[PDB]
Amino acid sequence: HWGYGKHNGPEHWHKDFPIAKGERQSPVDIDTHTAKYDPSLKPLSVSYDQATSLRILNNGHAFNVEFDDSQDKAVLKGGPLDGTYRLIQFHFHWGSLDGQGSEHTVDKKKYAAELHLVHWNTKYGDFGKAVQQPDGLAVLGIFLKVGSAKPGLQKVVDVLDSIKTKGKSADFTNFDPRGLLPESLDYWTYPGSLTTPPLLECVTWIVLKEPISVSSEQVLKFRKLNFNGEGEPEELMVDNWRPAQPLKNRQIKASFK
Numbered sequence: 001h002w003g004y005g006k007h008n009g010p011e012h013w014h015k016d017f018p019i020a021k022g023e024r025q026s027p028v029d030i031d032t033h034t035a036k037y038d039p040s041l042k043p044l045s046v047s048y049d050q051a052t053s054l055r056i057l058n059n060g061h062a063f064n065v066e067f068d069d070s071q072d073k074a075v076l077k078g079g080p081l082d083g084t085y086r087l088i089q090f091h092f093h094w095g096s097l098d099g100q101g102s103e104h105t106v107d108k109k110k111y112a113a114e115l116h117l118v119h120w121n122t123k124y125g126d127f128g129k130a131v132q133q134p135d136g137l138a139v140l141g142i143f144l145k146v147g148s149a150k151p152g153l154q155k156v157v158d159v160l161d162s163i164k165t166k167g168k169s170a171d172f173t174n175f176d177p178r179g180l181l182p183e184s185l186d187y188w189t190y191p192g193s194l195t196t197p198p199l200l201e202c203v204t205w206i207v208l209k210e211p212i213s214v215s216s217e218q219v220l221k222f223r224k225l226n227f228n229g230e231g232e233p234e235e236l237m238v239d240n241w242r243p244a245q246p247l248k249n250r251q252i253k254a255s256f257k
């Protein structure tokens with residue numbers, strides 16, 4: 001029902017998901033003048049050594065690379081987090097042109113795309129119970145700037161022809177998500193929400209300060225995907241980003257000075 005087009009785009013979501021006007025919506029602009037260093041924060045612990053990728057799926061809004069989350073195999077700990085969050089999937093949001101596509105912005109600067117590695121708090125047992133809790137998810141957000149190609153990303157860009165349309169999926173095993181991480185894990189953190197419907201306010205956002213680089217050829221391949229299913233009228237999957245929502249009564253913390 002909902003989408004990114006002009007008649008079903010983010011400005012409409014509130015009529016079916018009233019939480020769209022809640023007080024902890026994502027994404028937001030990260031005002032680095034206002035963000036507050038908190039040297040009580042811990043270092044993030046990203047353990048993806050045993051990550052087990054299963055499959056890549058075009059879901060009509062973006063593409064997800066899904067992981068086996070049935071055990072504590074790839075988990076995120078530390079930082080602002082209490083307890084252990086299991087990786088379930090990653091996906092990206094991106095623009096029709098290089099100067100837009102990211103969902104978070106940094107001092108109003110937009111990046112060409114953003115990667116979200118989605119993880120859920122193991123104290124809730126499964127992902128569907130976790131989304132109903134204010135501390136249920138932790139999403140690691142990583143900006144993409146256009147520059148020199150990312151080898152770790154090429155493996156994702158090479159399978160996209162096989163999931164070109166909505167509902168198509170392809171086996172995608174032995175993919176190592178470590179190859180999508182920048183050198184530094186310095187970050188900003190704030191309490192927020194899912195950025196697509198149901199827009200639930202269940203997310204601790206951890207947004208990395210250092211972007212990764214992707215080539216112009218690589219982000220071109222994202223923009224060749226289709227929102228529509230096979231058979232249907234072609235609608236390029238581009239601009240599948242929600243714009244920044246009001247910070248309201250929230251503090252963004254920084255792991256670094």
Ligand SMILES: NS(=O)(=O)c1nc2ccccc2s1
Pocket residue numbers: 001002003007008009012013014015016017
């Ligand atoms: N509120 S919404 O889920 O974004 C939505 N917008 C529209 C527009 C036309 C038809 C159905 C929906 S459902």
Ligand SMILES: NS(=O)(=O)c1nc2ccccc2s1
Pocket residue numbers: 116118139193194195196197198199
């Ligand atoms: N874009 S996001 O905030 O990482 C995200 N949104 C949603 C909505 C429904 C189910 C999974 C996710 S993960």
Ligand SMILES: [Zn+2]
Pocket residue numbers: 091092093116195
């Ligand atoms: Zn996302």
